[PDB]
Structures are given as structure tokens and as C-alpha cells.
Amino acid sequence: PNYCFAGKTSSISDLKEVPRKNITLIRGLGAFGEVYEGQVPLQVAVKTLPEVCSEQDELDFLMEALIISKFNHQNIVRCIGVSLQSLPRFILLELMAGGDLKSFLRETRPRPSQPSSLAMLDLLHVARDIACGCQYLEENHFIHRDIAARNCLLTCPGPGRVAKIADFGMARDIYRGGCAMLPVKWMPPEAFMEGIFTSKTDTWSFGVLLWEIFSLGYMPYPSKSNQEVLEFVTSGGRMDPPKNCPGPVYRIMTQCWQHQPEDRPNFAIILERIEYCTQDPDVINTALPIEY
16 A cells, blocks of 8 residues: 655555564553654654554554654654564564653642642743644644644653654544543534544644643643534534643644634644743743642
């Protein structure tokens, strides 16, 4: 099977096959398939394909490799290569020691133990990082379909951290699952209703990611089920600001959640507005809540 991105066609032959003897698994790092820290030395993350898998699982794994390998942007996780000619098959990825963004936010919340673990600027930098990645996808006409905190990774826990889009499983499934597994809480009305997807789809999802970020890792639409959210959003309902969220930041969210896709900003505009928030002393001097 071939893969097309940015007007070019690649195949399995285009993937950089790394000799299996050059790859060593160091430690597990935590649904389908496991992820390890590895060495090729170059430190990598290793995603494995279970040997007990269907032919469709194999094609899915291949397509994931093709998709990530063809992106070229600092805010999308790099693919070092693959090891598909030995079993179990490997995809070799940029090692992201900070882990996933949702877990990071939850575990690094300000507490009386760590009163200054995070500040507004840290959150705005994460938002900018992912918005930069989204802008790259948008300008290359790639619709992610699942922009959410769980699908982003951090290079490290500490101050120089960079956030990157990591998981492209939904886009992979669509490129060629069930209702219960659909990320409804991240989807715009035209998406779950008509199955219409555009870049304005990802704009809506990014608004929800922004809420995730500034809530410090809460599940969107607290206390609402998927179907309750669907009816809520379809009726015009929107989330309230996260605790202590600056007005200028919340306004970016609500612009991302405009009912009509044409009324939602593209990512160039979103980046401009995030940048403006980062300049505003009243925004960045706002204290985040301390979780007791």
C-alpha cells in the first residue's frame, strides 16, 4: 500500500529500515502494543507490533510508520526509522522523556509541595508548540481529527520542555473502532453529524486542548457523558473558563468553538493570538490554582 502526503507518494520501501542487531530495548515506558525506551548511541522510543495480530493490524502499523516518517516539523515527533523485517516489528521514534501532556499536566499541578511547579507562561508555551504543529498540518492539508492532550508528548518535564503532536492513529484509521471510541468531546458539530472534516475540524479540537491545558489536565465537559456533550454542543452549549483562566485565553477557546467552521480562526490566527497573550503581563502574571 502507498501513502500520499504533500502531493508525494511513498511506500514501505521508503521507510528507513534499521538493522535489528543495532537496536536494544532498555526498559518499558508503560492499549495495542507496548512502548519501550531503546538505543540504536541514539536514544529512542520503540513502538512494537504484537506478533499475534491481524493482517489489518499489520497494515495499520505500516501506515502509521509511513505517516510519521513523512512529516517534517519540530513540533511533530520524529521517526528515526523502523525495524519491519524482524519480529516483533518496531517503529523507532523520538524519545519524549516528558511523557504525554495530559499526564504531565495532572502530575505537575501546583501543590503546597510544589507551589511554583507551573506558571501561565509554561501553559502558553505548550499551546504555542502544538499550535505550530497544527499550522504545519493545516498548510499541508492534513487533518489530524484527534487533537487532544493525550495525543501530545513532551521532550522533558523541566523548563526547556517542547510539546509535540505524537499520536496519529485516528488519521491513520481514516486514511485506510466504533461509536463508543470516537473522541466526541473534541469534535465539532459538523464532524459527528455529517462526518464532514476540514482543517476547521482541528481548530475546534485545539480549542478543547486549550481548555485541557489551562484546566491543568481535566477531562473536558466535567460530569457530561459523550452523548450529553453531543447534545450540549449541538445546542450551542460551551465549556466555562478553566479555574483562573485569563479572559484573553478563554476568548481564544470560544473563537475555536464557533458553530460555523468558516467563523473559526485558522492556526496562523490562533498563533497570533497565543503570542499576544504571552506578551500581556496581566495574562502571564496570573497565578494558577494550587491543588490542595
